[PDB]
Amino acid sequence: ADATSVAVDASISAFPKKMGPPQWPFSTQYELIGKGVRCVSSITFKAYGLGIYVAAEDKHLVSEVLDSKFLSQAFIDTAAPPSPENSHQDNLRAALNDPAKAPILINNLLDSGIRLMSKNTPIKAGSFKLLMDGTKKSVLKNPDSQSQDKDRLEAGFQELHDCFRSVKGLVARDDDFFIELNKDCSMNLSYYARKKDEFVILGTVKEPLIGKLLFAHYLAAVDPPSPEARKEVIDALVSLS
Ligand SMILES: O=C(O)CCC(=O)C(=O)O
């Protein structure tokens, strides 16, 4: 690793701190805000390296979306108020780690137009393919999914499934599966076959509910795919607010 990349696991490449066009086939320039290893059961069994990125041009939105006004209004009737001597950053941090407040804060963040990107780098290819198959079931444990249009959810997961069909044939260690969350919550999916030094553009998931559900899962305070990646993301967001 260089000062321009960070180590996630010795079995796979260091993650760039910044990624954008033209070097990478992305919509805008992204900055790494959290990383970690997605394990299955134990740290003994590493499935993939996870990197969460924010659009450089959108970092300003965090403080405007997750401001003290929204914190106060969201929970003014539900929870005791935050202590007035605390900083806003301290108050926001406590809410983002509170199981009862975090989903609401994250949903509001994910509706604000902020562009995010996940870098999903396989460590064990077989496990990764299985985690792909299980993605719909996983993100739908989210209770907020039930209120939504079932037909739109099903159609959106077919879009994702089709993109995943193309990924699964390629999966190998140290390849990069990229998922960009556009400002309208549709998703551009791409794939870097590292050994060929080739980019594959997989397509777009138009249904915005799918990107909302997937990135709410990445950033979930309870049972996120990578607890260590989520913690880093939250610290990045608090420090921006
Ligand atoms: O295909 C992916 O990387 C998403 C799956 C996921 O969120 C996980 O189970 O870790």
Author numbering: 70 to 310
Question: What does the original paper state about this entry?
Answer:
Full-length constructs of Aim18p and Aim46p possessing N-terminal 8X-His tags were insoluble, but truncating the N-terminal mitochondrial targeting sequence and transmembrane domain for Aim18p and Aim46p (Aim18p-Nd70 and Aim46p-Nd62, respectively) dramatically increased solubility. Additionally, the structure of Aim46p-Nd62-WT contained a small molecule resembling α-ketoglutarate in the active site (Document S2), but we were unable to confirm its identity via mass spectrometry. Despite multiple attempts, we were unable to generate heme-bound crystal structures for either Aim18p or Aim46p. Alignments of the Aim18-Nd70-R123A and Aim46-Nd62-WT structures with the bacterial protein revealed that, while the α-helices differed substantially, the core CHI antiparallel β-sheet was structurally homologous to the core antiparallel β-sheet of cytochrome c'β-Met. Of note is a region of the Aim18p-Nd70 and Aim46-Nd62 structures that lies in between plant CHI α1 and α2. This region contains an extra loop that is absent in plant CHI domain–containing proteins but is conserved across multiple ascomycete Aim18p and Aim46p homologs. Nearly all of the CHI catalytic residues are substituted nonconservatively in Aim18p and Aim46p except for the catalytic arginine, which is invariably conserved in fungal homologs of Aim18p and Aim46p. A single nonconservative mutation in these residues is sufficient to nearly abolish catalytic activity, so the presence of several substitutions suggests that Aim18p and Aim46p likely lack canonical CHI enzymatic activity. Upon treatment with sodium carbonate, Aim18p was liberated into the soluble fraction, while a significant proportion of Aim46p remained in the insoluble fraction, suggesting that Aim46p′s transmembrane domain might be more strongly associated with the IMM.
Saccharomyces cerevisiae possesses two predicted CHI-like proteins, Aim18p (encoded by YHR198C) and Aim46p (YHR199C), but it lacks other enzymes of the flavonoid pathway, suggesting that Aim18p and Aim46p employ the CHI fold for distinct purposes. Here, we demonstrate using proteinase K protection assays, sodium carbonate extractions, and crystallography that Aim18p and Aim46p reside on the mitochondrial inner membrane and adopt CHI folds, but they lack select active site residues and possess an extra fungal-specific loop. Consistent with these differences, Aim18p and Aim46p lack CHI activity and also the fatty acid–binding capabilities of other CHI-like proteins, but instead bind heme. We further show that diverse fungal homologs also bind heme and that Aim18p and Aim46p possess structural homology to a bacterial hemoprotein.
